[PDB]
Every structure is written in structure tokens, then in C-alpha cells.
């Protein structure tokens, strides 16, 4: 059919794809620092992390007004991790493991919107 | 004239178009998170926009959003 939650699941597919490029550009920046100017590698990382956290804030806000609380539970723990980084503002091995999980989490949830949206459109 | 389900869809589409235009203007005209909201607001209210997107991937968002606010306003009237 046509519901407000069905449209919210459609905007996520276009927006979550942009969040994929951020975590992919992150592992590239960490790969360059592992091989080795150093200011440009970290200052750019500070500029890319802010939109990634703000865009996900809409994912927790769109589904809140869409009454789809079954999907919100799959995004609340992701937003809680952003509060730890925002509060406090070797490290290479720790941050590397803290970024590979982002690519897997932003991809497994990406397939949900590709299927949960179909579960409402064709189900008219 | 417009159901309450459409008014909730317009606001999130307005912000959704705005955040995409900011992401398009980031991979490369400033078009920050603030100027994109102003340009999209000036385009939805049929007013004269201050600036226009320079890149092709930014011009697509402008032309598509222009067709969106034209159909919605014409349907509301």
C-alpha cells in the first residue's frame, strides 16, 4: 500500500548508502596511517565523522514518527555508541576493530530496508 | 486539502532532499548543511532561489525537487 513508514524505509536506502561510503573511506584512512601530512589524515577524519553520526540521528527519528518500533531497536545501540565518542573528545589496533564492525552493521541493516519496504508496498 | 500523512511525508522529504544535496556538495559552491536548507526552503515556497547547484549530480536534485513542489502546490490549490 502507501504508509508513512513505507516512505521512511525508502529514504533510508538512499541515505544508508551514503553512510556506507563513510565507513569505507575510514578503513582507507586507517590503512594509510598503518603503512606510514599526518594532520591532514586525522583532521579529515574529524570532518567525516560528524555527518555520519548526524545522518544516523535521522534514522532514529524517522522511524520514531513512523510507528516502526521493531526497527528502532536495531538502531538504538548504534546511537548509544556515538554518545561515548561525543563525551570524550595501541589505538591503531583498537580503532581498526571499531571500524570493521561499522561496515558490517551498516550493510546488514541496509538489506532490511531493501526487504522491509517490500513487505509493505506489495502487501496492499 | 492534504491528509496528515502527506504533511509528515513532505517535511522528511524536505530534510531528506536537503541532506542529500549537502552530501553531493561534499564529495567535490559551498552548499553546506545550512545553505542547502535555505535553498530547498526557497524552492518549496515558489520563491527566487539565492544560488543554483553547479555540479550535474547537484542539478539533478534541484530539478527533481522543483518538480516535486510544483505538483504538491498545484494539487493543494
Amino acid at each position: 500500500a502507501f504508509t508513512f513508514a513505507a516512505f521512511c524505509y525508502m529514504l533510508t536506502l538512499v541515505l544508508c548508502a551514503s553512510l556506507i561510503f563513510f565507513v569505507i573511506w575510514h578503513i582507507i584512512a586507517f590503512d594509510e596511517l598503518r603503512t606510514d601530512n599526518i594532520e591532514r589524515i586525522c583532521c579529515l577524519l574529524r570532518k567525516l565523522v560528524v555527518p555520519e553520526y548526524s545522518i544516523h540521528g535521522l534514522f532514529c527519528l524517522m522511524f520514531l514518527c513512523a510507528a516502526e518500533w521493531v526497527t528502532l531497536g536495531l538502531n538504538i545501540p548504534l546511537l548509544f555508541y556515538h554518545l561515548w565518542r561525543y563525551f570524550h573528545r595501541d589505538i591503531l589496533n583498537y580503532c581498526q576493530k571499531e571500524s570493521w564492525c561499522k561496515l558490517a552493521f551498516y550493510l546488514l541493516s541496509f538489506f532490511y530496508y531493501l526487504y522491509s519496504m517490500v513487505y509493505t508496498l506489495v502487501s496492499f | 486539502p492534504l491528509a496528515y500523512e502527506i504533511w509528515m511525508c513532505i517535511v522528511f522529504a524536505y530534510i531528506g532532499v536537503s541532506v542529500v544535496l549537502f552530501l553531493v556538495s561534499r564529495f567535490s559552491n559551498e552548499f553546506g548543511i545550512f545553505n542547502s536548507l535555505w535553498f530547498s526552503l526557497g524552492a518549496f515556497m515558489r520563491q527566487g532561489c539565492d544560488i543554483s547547484p553547479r555540479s550535474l549530480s547537484g542539478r539533478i536534485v534541484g530539478g527533481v525537487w522543483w518538480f516535486f513542489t510544483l505538483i504538491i502546490i498545484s494539487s493543494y490549490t
Partner: peptide, 24 residues
């Protein structure tokens, strides 16, 4: 239909931005 057109335009713009970023 206009919402579908909006979503398709956003997706096409994202793809064109990806292409133009990978062009360099």
C-alpha cells in the same frame, strides 16, 4: 508518483556523484 520520481532522482544523483568522485 512524484515521491517515486523524487526517490529515483536522489538515487541517480548519488550514483552520478559516485561516478564523478571515482573519475578523479
Amino acid at each position: 508518483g512524484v515521491f517515486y520520481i523524487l526517490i529515483g532522482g536522489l538515487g541517480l544523483a548519488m550514483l552520478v556523484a559516485l561516478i564523478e568522485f571515482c573519475y578523479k
